[PDB]
Amino acid sequence: MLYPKESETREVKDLSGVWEFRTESDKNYILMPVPASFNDITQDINLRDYVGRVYYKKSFFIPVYWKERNIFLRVGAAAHFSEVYVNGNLVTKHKGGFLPFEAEISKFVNYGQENIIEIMVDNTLTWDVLPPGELKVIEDEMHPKGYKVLNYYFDFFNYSGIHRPVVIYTTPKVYIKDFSVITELSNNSALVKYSIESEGNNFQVILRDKDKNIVAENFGKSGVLEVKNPKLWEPGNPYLYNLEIKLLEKDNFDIYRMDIGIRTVRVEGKQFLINEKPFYFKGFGKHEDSDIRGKGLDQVINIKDFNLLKWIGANSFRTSHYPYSEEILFLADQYGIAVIEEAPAVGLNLWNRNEKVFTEGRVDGKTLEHHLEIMRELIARDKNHPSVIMWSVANEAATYEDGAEEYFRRVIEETRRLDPTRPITIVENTKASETKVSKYVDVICVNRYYSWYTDSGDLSVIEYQLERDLREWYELYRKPIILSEFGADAISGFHSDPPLMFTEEYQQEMIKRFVGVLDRLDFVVGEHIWNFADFMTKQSITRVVGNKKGVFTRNRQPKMVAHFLKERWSKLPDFWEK
Amino acid sequence: MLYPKESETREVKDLSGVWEFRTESDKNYILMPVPASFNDITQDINLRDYVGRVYYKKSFFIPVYWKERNIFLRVGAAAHFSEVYVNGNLVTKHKGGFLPFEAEISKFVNYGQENIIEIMVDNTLTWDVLPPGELKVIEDEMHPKGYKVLNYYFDFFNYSGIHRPVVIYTTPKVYIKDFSVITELSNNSALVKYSIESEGNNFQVILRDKDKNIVAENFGKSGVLEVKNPKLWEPGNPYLYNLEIKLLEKDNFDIYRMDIGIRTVRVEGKQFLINEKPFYFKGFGKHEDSDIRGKGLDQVINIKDFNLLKWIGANSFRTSHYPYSEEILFLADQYGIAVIEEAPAVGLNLWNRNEKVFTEGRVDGKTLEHHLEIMRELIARDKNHPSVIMWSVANEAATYEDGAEEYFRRVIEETRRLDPTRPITIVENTKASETKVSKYVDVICVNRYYSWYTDSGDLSVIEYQLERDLREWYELYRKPIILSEFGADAISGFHSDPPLMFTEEYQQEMIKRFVGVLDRLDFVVGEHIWNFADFMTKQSITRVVGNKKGVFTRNRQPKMVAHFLKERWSKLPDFWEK
Numbered sequence A, B: 001m002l003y004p005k006e007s008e009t010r011e012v013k014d015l016s017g018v019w020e021f022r023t024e025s026d027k028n029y030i031l032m033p034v035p036a037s038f039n040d041i042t043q044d045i046n047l048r049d050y051v052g053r054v055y056y057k058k059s060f061f062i063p064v065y066w067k068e069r070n071i072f073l074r075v076g077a078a079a080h081f082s083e084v085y086v087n088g089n090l091v092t093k094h095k096g097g098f099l100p101f102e103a104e105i106s107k108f109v110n111y112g113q114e115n116i117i118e119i120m121v122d123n124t125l126t127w128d129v130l131p132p133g134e135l136k137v138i139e140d141e142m143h144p145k146g147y148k149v150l151n152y153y154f155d156f157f158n159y160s161g162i163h164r165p166v167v168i169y170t171t172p173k174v175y176i177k178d179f180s181v182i183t184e185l186s187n188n189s190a191l192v193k194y195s196i197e198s199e200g201n202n203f204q205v206i207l208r209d210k211d212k213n214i215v216a217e218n219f220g221k222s223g224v225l226e227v228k229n230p231k232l233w234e235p236g237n238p239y240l241y242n243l244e245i246k247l248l249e250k251d252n253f254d255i256y257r258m259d260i261g262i263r264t265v266r267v268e269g270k271q272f273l274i275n276e277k278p279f280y281f282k283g284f285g286k287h288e289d290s291d292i293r294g295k296g297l298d299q300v301i302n303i304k305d306f307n308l309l310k311w312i313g314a315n316s317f318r319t320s321h322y323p324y325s326e327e328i329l330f331l332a333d334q335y336g337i338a339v340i341e342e343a344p345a346v347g348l349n350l351w352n353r354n355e356k357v358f359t360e361g362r363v364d365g366k367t368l369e370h371h372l373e374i375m376r377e378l379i380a381r382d383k384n385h386p387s388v389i390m391w392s393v394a395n396e397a398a399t400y401e402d403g404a405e406e407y408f409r410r411v412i413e414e415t416r417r418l419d420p421t422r423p424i425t426i427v428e429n430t431k432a433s434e435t436k437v438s439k440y441v442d443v444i445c446v447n448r449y450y451s452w453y454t455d456s457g458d459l460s461v462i463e464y465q466l467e468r469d470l471r472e473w474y475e476l477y478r479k480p481i482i483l484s485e486f487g488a489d490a491i492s493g494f495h496s497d498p499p500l501m502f503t504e505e506y507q508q509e510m511i512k513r514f515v516g517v518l519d520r521l522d523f524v525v526g527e528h529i530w531n532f533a534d535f536m537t538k539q540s541i542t543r544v545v546g547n548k549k550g551v552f553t554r555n556r557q558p559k560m561v562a563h564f565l566k567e568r569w570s571k572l573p574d575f576w577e578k
Ligand SMILES: [Cl-]
Pocket: A155, A530, A547, A549
């Protein structure tokens, strides 16, 4: 499914705005913005911590002239289970809170009249949705009848609601359903190879440069476009060409356009190559999180975040720990930021080797089935973005378990089959010698928190422990390694010398000592600090109103270590043969 | 008067601790620690803001064996007017809140019995005490009968109380009253020249090195001690010799010891020479200020402050804006920190050229008389500390006024007469071409706040304005220049990019741009940032609970710019021929 875009042949109507909202088995509505998480909008603590079904409702008018058009209703994201009703008719259901879903609804609309859309969203986690969790009953001596808790083991808050825009769009009855683009370098040219999915068959395809000059054209539902003297897309030079696809049939006419970038990505030895040059990742793990709206899409915050990425000198980030909005990937295309996009397989770990995760009752064949469908949906959505340069299949799963090996072999095999054009990783906090899964990926991503979660407060252990660990990863697997997470919680304004945990000084010193180690290791091709910004988590005595490891505050202002990273990364080239 | 020190011939009894305390015309006492300001000790807002007389009271016992000894009662400091009573007898009065005073009290004590000391302290400012102020009656339409305000124009809070220790000490009836030491370099030796003040006349004087080896000796009330192969005192090498003075008479025997340092100080051209090498000041304006105790002496805070000075790489500070406790100068001697010690002539300015300061009714002959007595008391107290390397006669007086010229000519002339061994400065915020006073000093000290108090928020003006200004100071006066103050208020934890006033970023960027200018000017011999730490001021819409220009918080932890200064100053030598 293609991102909804207006053209000569397609209308788009955005239903974002103020909706009516209620919780299960309640008749009274309140007002609720869309897109947004509902948790922080009100002062009702029982809604903040609500677990169950909520219902959104809105009126909309369909123009009579949309008859004899396809009418699609698209929901960008709703966490985690959703059902969509048009005038009381169920038009689609969806499982998974971080990818879009849509249905054709012309059969159910009142033309030239009022219509009602209702969207049910259920935030109840189970062990066969990603990320997983479990609702548990607690009726003991200290809890009243009916006390229940939603348990989950990922470290970000279970925000719920409609997190990305709801839109209605039209197409002709015979229309461009999808297309695939692959770019190759050939002699002094680039090739853009394409295939179009449609019931139609007569297509003209045109490629235009930045100045609207036509640089290539082809008649054909599949084909190759040759670009002589191409300008390649890469961090530091985000050149985009505009691909125009025109269906020209007897009764149907359809146009779809997308900006694409010409680049190659390849792993060879201990090098991560973009356009055949050795890349060095400088960046962050991020989160879709901001004040008040929770996980809701906000283009103000998105553009602010990319300007901060360019300001600090980052060239990349990982979409920890789930696919982000398409909007963020289009921006990464424009700004020239390399993206590792990650499936929502986070929380597959009970920090305890006595509780097994990959076992009947928890992560099983049903979870695997969902994970495989997720990879198919994710690659289908994002396969044409130049900014996505790697897929991450999971974050900190219990990869030391025997059952994790067969599980992830299947996930990894399916991902590569779906997209052979990008490398694959998995983000590990398991010990190097214990993971049964990292031997199957292209690039190793390791999260390490020496002197924070272990030997807390003792910065002196970092060089000893980190160098020994990373050398063992390389000795066992002989793959490029990204230090995919490291950092320390810092309360803005907490200062100390000597540095103490939770101060800005400790965060900067820890990060500084980690990267001094990486500079001595020629097989380390990247550093991603956790996290870009402070974000909300569930409440616990270990979380000082959320996770405070941001390099920026939640309102997008820098802590001390942001300036250290700006100075370091201004000296580090994007392409660096270590 | 010499600092009270125990020896074979002298006892010291410290009366610090818990005293009884009351305000004027009130019979009920509360408890009050000494030394401390009384303002922040209680939760009584009317005592915090009290103006008038307060009374301290304490019992003490004199041993019968102190008969036929001199018994001295010393008050380290009490702001600003004080009277001392022993068993109801007035033994001394004192004017000025930052220098010690004492009296011989054997005539008034009950030997082997209880005694009562009472100390009255008055914090009411006038135009003939330093620093000056004025109590004003405000009985208009919006103020009730009896509303009064203490107006003053210096930017630190008018803390009051007994700020330094009260002690009683004994001496023999014929005793060492004072001594003067001057050090010179001669061939490969150093000379320590001395004169002793006493009714006695037979003296043996011995000088010992760090390991208690005797390196020089002399019999004589005046004389010269030769030190072959001297180890000189300087920042980065604080070598101290111990001077022992022994009075040996028929009926009287007295010993006094003091650590001294061998160093010379001299201004020549645009150079400030210590031990004939070109010094570069790296440091701060400080304040005697800390949480809860106000201006009270606290040796924990003092030692913490010197360890921070060494940690950040500072080699100097100015005692803005008054003499500090003797304790701090003994520590500066031990740590090797160069001190510019300043008289309390601050607040001689009504930021307004229509209100004249040096005029009948304000700063006049009575103020001058007090200022001259202050310089005599200050040099008499501190003349033998190696750490004091310069006297500052005032801070930000209205030196553009005609009347300021005659006033300060007399102050400067008297200071040089009292101590020809150290250079003299005055700290200016007047425009270079307008001051009528800086032409009379040895070193120029200028306070500049471009982009803070003027063109607020615009960091881009700094290089243009500061370089032009400092070149004009040098062109007019041809003297070495210290940038004696510059900085910005920063709330700990306030961050922004781009930098905004009151953020840690703005403070660091402003300071960074100022010192980049100084590095290009070979006549600038010093940089002192305002301030070492956040300190309290009177309340106003311009003061966010005090002055927030500290590089350290009030609890002595670093802000962002502290780390910038540590890195800069670790690269700058103490002795630097620019
Ligand atoms: Cl974390």
